[PDB]
């Protein structure tokens, strides 16, 4: 089971990631304005 | 409750993506202006 | 000491969301210049 | 092991905190604009 | 298993690190605007 919320703990944070570097896009938007 | 607490550490993790995509909101907010 | 340490996570897991939370409190300042 | 790299994982979680609360400052930087 | 997971975790947690020195860089840009 510790390895199962482990494995469920990864895919939230590469969840966080993906969102991280949209934020990241969009601060560029804002530099090219 | 080694179980119990990585279950915890979860739902915070899902907190913080809540919060990550509201910025990205606020950021898009930004870039319409 | 598995327990105290995962516990000490949830806290500075609850910090980070403390200041996710003033970062879009921010980006709401911003918004309204 | 588990106590190490539970503690390893603690110190990357504060540099996380460390990084926010450089941001927050720098929005209110920006704000001041 | 479980170490293996953990280091999988400070992988991840390295590079929201790194994520986030790139969102500060461009806040410092956007301060130079």
């Not at 969102?19 to 990241?24: A, V």
């Amino acid at each position: 089971t510790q390895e199962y919320l482990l494995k469920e703990i990864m895919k939230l944070l590469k969840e966080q990631i993906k969102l991280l570097k949209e934020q990241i896009k969009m601060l560029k938007e804002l530099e090219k304005q």
